Design a protein around this ligand. Sequence first.
Ligand SMILES: OC[C@H]1O[C@@H](O[C@H]2[C@H](O)[C@H](O)[C@H](O)O[C@@H]2CO)[C@@H](O)[C@@H](O)[C@@H]1O
Ligand SMILES: OC[C@H]1O[C@@H](O)[C@@H](O)[C@@H](O)[C@@H]1O
Length: 563
Amino acid sequence: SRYKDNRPLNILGIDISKMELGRYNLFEVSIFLQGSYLNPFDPQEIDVEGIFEDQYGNQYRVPGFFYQEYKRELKNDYEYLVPVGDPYFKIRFSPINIGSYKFFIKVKDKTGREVSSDKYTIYVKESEKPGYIRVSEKNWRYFKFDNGRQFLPIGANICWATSKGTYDYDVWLPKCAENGGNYFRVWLGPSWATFALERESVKEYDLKNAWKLDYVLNLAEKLNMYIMFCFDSYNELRYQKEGAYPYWEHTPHYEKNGGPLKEPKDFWTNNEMIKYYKNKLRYIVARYGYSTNVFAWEFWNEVDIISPTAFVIGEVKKWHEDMAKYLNSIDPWKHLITTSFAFSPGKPEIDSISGLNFVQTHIYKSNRYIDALLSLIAYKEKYRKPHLVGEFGLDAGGNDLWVDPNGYVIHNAIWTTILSGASGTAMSWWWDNHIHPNNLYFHYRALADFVKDINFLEEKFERLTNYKFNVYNREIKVIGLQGKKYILLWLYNAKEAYQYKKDIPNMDSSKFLGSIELLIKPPIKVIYYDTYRGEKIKELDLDKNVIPIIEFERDLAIKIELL
Ligand SMILES: OC[C@H]1O[C@@H](O[C@H]2[C@H](O)[C@H](O)[C@H](O)O[C@@H]2CO)[C@@H](O)[C@@H](O)[C@@H]1O
Ligand SMILES: OC[C@H]1O[C@@H](O)[C@@H](O)[C@@H](O)[C@@H]1O
């Protein structure tokens, strides 16, 4: 209890960032106070709240959070944070309507005493921000922003940094964003993670790592990138003898290390653990919920490979139901909620929960992974909510960086997933040792430039069929979408797409390979698109339903417009 206080409850000061701001922008209040509490992260010890009301009567009850300011520096090869000033409490709000808001601050400590701040008025003007990310009501396969524009996640996992900490995100994120990336995922556990909130304790949260997460979220705000926050990872509940980067012996949850749990099975039902987990959710909502750059709350990385002594499907399901309900109830902005599994088909008992707004796949597979992605995407349409392939790679023991230094595997997967009907790109691993040093960002730029002007929410896209190849010299396969107005094709050579030794193609090729006949009504306009250079190659008007296939080395994209 290093942050305890033993004084009569009183507000000592309030600082307000600005009295005028734009729609969906951050409005921050600093609160200096004294009171009686053992743990500023526990609302039963001290509960700070901001009560906001727009001019239409809508009310928002925003929990406040304990905060320490830091100044970062780089000490040779590691980030070091110097504390600045005493810690204090903050409220972070974001207005969804324009016009006037009134708000006040309310504080209650463990004595039951309650104090209040006077009503303040702020004014909100229109801004460029599109709002929070939601499931599309027009097409449940896809995400939208509040303003109705689509959100197609294009990016990769970027889940933790080296010892350089936030300085790595300074490098990775601008490169991602300038190459069409608008998405990444970060880990808030286990305790070794860059943004670990439960670093030494499950009762009190790490103010340095929370500040690093502030920094990276602010950088995403500047770059128009949107983040999935993964709260916990399976390692926390996996025993040393079970392998796969286990961490139970080191995790703060374990009684040996000060926590409430005698064994990982008890995580799901232990009353003390559930209480502190809800305090963590409240802290996360308080500190980060305002941000439209939070794409989603993700409870678990691969919860199915916690210790087999700890995975009880009925209890994990109930815990996800209860925590999703709680999180929704306290999150004024109702961010999307999800969870993930190592087993690529997932766990239907959990994926079917209505409180999980979208489902995910993790898949590491070396052989015929294009077909495996297609099959999984087709299968999970049964949930009638969006599907994110949140992790993807070879099953090569982490050797992708030297088996495939050109990123052909990533290339194949991001084209396959977005043109099979998934909500966005397959999300690669290996951001730090592969994507960045091998400079693989250009793959994403080529894909983003192909899809960005299509409104997927209105095309009524269906996976391509009723097609007939007529190709004699090669084995060419197709992944395709057929919509109201567009047909999008990704063609690949089955005998070249899975070999990674040759250099990046630079076709000069103008040559005729074969044809693909589609059941569509002509006339049409056909655009041939280089998937490595990210450029239109050729354009052709047609009066029949048979599209010539021009020469290409590994794969080729075609955009067809029904006229
Ligand atoms: O290297 C940093 C952390 O790696 C962690 O293991 C990772 C591992 O690097 C790899 O990405 C693997 O497939 O997923 C693991 C996490 O589940 C931990 O070993 C951690 O201790 C390291 O700091
Ligand atoms: O920032 C990502 C990486 O960039 C490299 O050039 C080095 O500086 C690494 O130390 C760093 O982790």
